[PDB]
Structure 1
Amino acid sequence: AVQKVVVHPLVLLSVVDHFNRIGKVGNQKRVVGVLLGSWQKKVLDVSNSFAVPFDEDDKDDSVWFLDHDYLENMYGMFKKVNARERIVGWYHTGPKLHKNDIAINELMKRYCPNSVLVIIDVKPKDLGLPTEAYISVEEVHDDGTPTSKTFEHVTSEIGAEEAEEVGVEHLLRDIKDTTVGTLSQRITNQVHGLKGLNSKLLDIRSYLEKVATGKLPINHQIIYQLQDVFNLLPDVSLQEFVKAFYLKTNDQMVVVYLASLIRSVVALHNLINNKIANRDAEKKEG
């Protein structure tokens, strides 16, 4: 149904406010906020959101506390001031997906339309993208397990339309723009290996742990496609790609001729002014 979503940083800075208005009490649980957006178009666009007092139990996980009057009053007044945005779903700040999320999401599945779920981290130490759109749809399983709520990962992007780019750029004054060239390219080409190294290294360790020490079926069926796609590149002998290395290396030669020739053109004004300025300033100094 929905291919991609658009999440503005305003809601995540509202999660910064979720971490600001705590009051130093010692709970810091998965505070659930009422996510708002535009479900009209096929693409989802989050503009702003708000929160609702949400408290769980220490031992029992099935305890969840929501509010209907606060949702209808905040949504009623928010719709009165801005009717272009309506309820879409919710989101929790907890890093782990608990079992009670089917009951928490089930309320906004009954009263509200199909709600999207977003899992983020309480500490911004994760290098990866903090936002993951999880659609709440029921899927048929091939093994015969009963139909239940399944959270499929929907791709997400963090973009601002008109003003939040200006506000973020003015508040930071440290981040740089695209700036195609040497630095913005070589930084990605340096740290990219760590950007994949922390993800893969962080995932395959617990993966290999759950291979031998795993039960409660983790959908082992998708592991066959995992190792299949991993074995779709069986160390090609590079025999056919030699001519492609001749093409890319020939373009490399083109960049060699462009650099040497163009820089040789740049040497004109320098290697002329260095003489005509020094000898004339010297002969005319005294």
Structure 2
Amino acid sequence: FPGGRVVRLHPVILASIVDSYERRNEGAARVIGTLLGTVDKHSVEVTNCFSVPHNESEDEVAVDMEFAKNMYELHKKVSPNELILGWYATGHDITEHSVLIHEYYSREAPNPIHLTVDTSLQNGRMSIKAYVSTSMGVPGRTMGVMFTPLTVKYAYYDTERIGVDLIMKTCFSPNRVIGLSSDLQQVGGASARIQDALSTVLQYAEDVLSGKVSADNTVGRFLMSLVNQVPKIVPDDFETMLNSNINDLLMVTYLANLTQSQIALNEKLVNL
């Protein structure tokens, strides 16, 4: 089966890209390393990487592999995640140096799985692009390797990825995480603005002529999905259940600020 279909890395390696490229320690343009990733042999589940100082020019090829082997020992010793998969490089894409460091990678001899870093302000070109190669026969020149592109999936632990989702809101304009409750109710309201502005126009489009096309039983099913679990139909018996909930939180909350008093009250008659 094709080993290279989709490489499943997450924003740890995105943070490994920028930081390594925003200090560099005189890393002119091109930073490279050995990609660390697991293999289900269909979807390539990736986590971490680690980087090297290079003089990547023509025709000087440099990836400190032995060092990348020794910090492979570090990365695995810290977390039992993966083993080395390939070389991960900055711009530009496939040339003679990328295959001369694949020689440096066949020095240790696993199955290659790569990841390019895009040093550009394009929007059409995706920020990050993973690469494999077949043929991969090569008892010939240096390495005449036939590169396949790999689409990326951003799939690991989801409270990271919702942590990412607020890093996306930092990315917009931070956005410190201080007022958790108060501010996750602001974005809960922001969600409800998206509903009303969306639901009104997809109504009034079919009031005019032929709206609710991509909104017939797509959002129509997801209007139903809104009301599936908020609110509940109109059951005043469940409102009483809640109104007794309003009693028990008051209690949880009262117990709460009393044990606040029970700090200094008991714990500090030490303080006389």
TM-score by length of 1: 0.53
Match of 1:134 among 131, 134, 154: 131
Cα deviation code 1:177-219 (max 9, x no counterpart): 9x6868789xxxxxxxxxxxxxxxxxxxxxxxxxxxxxxxxxx
Q: 1:129 to 1:183 in 2, by over 3 A?
A: farther
Contact kept, 8 Å, 1:31 with 1:54, in 2: the verdict is yes
Q: Equivalent pairs: percent with the same residue?
A: 27
1-structure distance, mates of 2:41, 2:122: 33
Residue 75 of structure 1 and its aligned partner are, at CA, apart by 1.2
Which residue pairs with 1:65 in the alignment? 62
1-structure distance, mates of 2:166, 2:10: 17
The CA RMSD measured in Å over matched residues stands at 3.6
Contact kept, 8 Å, 1:114 with 1:136, in 2: the verdict is no
2-structure distance, mates of 1:30, 1:159: 27
Q: 1:251 to 1:103 in 2, by over 3 A?
A: same
Residue 138 of structure 1 and its aligned partner are, at CA, apart by 0.7
- Map 1:7-86 onto structure 2 (within 5 A): 7-23=9-25, 25=26, 28-57=28-57, 61-86=58-83
Contact kept, 8 Å, 1:36 with 1:87, in 2: the verdict is yes
SS of the residue aligned with 2:103?
helix
- Give the counterpart letter for 2:125 in structure 1: G
Whether 1:155 aligns to 2:155 is: no
Residue 4 of structure 1 and its aligned partner are, at CA, apart by 1.8
Which residue pairs with 2:232 in the alignment? none
2-structure distance, mates of 1:251, 1:22: 52
Q: 1:250 to 1:169 in 2, by over 3 A?
A: closer
Q: 1:136 to 1:121 in 2, by over 3 A?
A: same
Q: 1:158 to 1:128 in 2, by over 3 A?
A: farther
Which residue pairs with 2:92 in the alignment? 95
SS of the residue aligned with 2:111?
coil
Match of 2:108 among 108, 111, 133: 111
Q: 1:33 to 1:69 in 2, by over 3 A?
A: closer
Q: 1:164 to 1:71 in 2, by over 3 A?
A: same
- Give the counterpart letter for 1:162 in structure 2: D
SS of the residue aligned with 2:153?
strand
Extract unaligned runs of 5+ from structure 2: 138-142, 173-186, 200-209, 221-272
Q: 1:168 to 1:110 in 2, by over 3 A?
A: same
Contact kept, 8 Å, 2:63 with 2:104, in 1: the verdict is no
2-structure distance, mates of 1:68, 1:155: 26
Contact kept, 8 Å, 1:88 with 1:112, in 2: the verdict is no
Q: 1:104 to 1:250 in 2, by over 3 A?
A: closer
Contact kept, 8 Å, 2:36 with 2:83, in 1: the verdict is yes
TM-score by length of 2: 0.55
Residue 69 of structure 1 and its aligned partner are, at CA, apart by 3.2
1-structure distance, mates of 2:55, 2:148: 26
Residue 92 of structure 1 and its aligned partner are, at CA, apart by 0.9
Contact kept, 8 Å, 1:119 with 1:130, in 2: the verdict is no
Contact kept, 8 Å, 1:87 with 1:112, in 2: the verdict is no
Residue 85 of structure 1 and its aligned partner are, at CA, apart by 1.4
Extract unaligned runs of 5+ from structure 1: 141-146, 186-248, 260-286
Contact kept, 8 Å, 1:108 with 1:114, in 2: the verdict is no
- Give the counterpart letter for 1:32 in structure 2: I
Cα deviation code 1:210-233 (max 9, x no counterpart): xxxxxxxxxxxxxxxxxxxxxxxx
Aligned residue pairs total: 182
Contact kept, 8 Å, 1:31 with 1:93, in 2: the verdict is yes
- Map 1:145-184 onto structure 2 (within 5 A): 148-173=144-169
2-structure distance, mates of 1:45, 1:111: 21
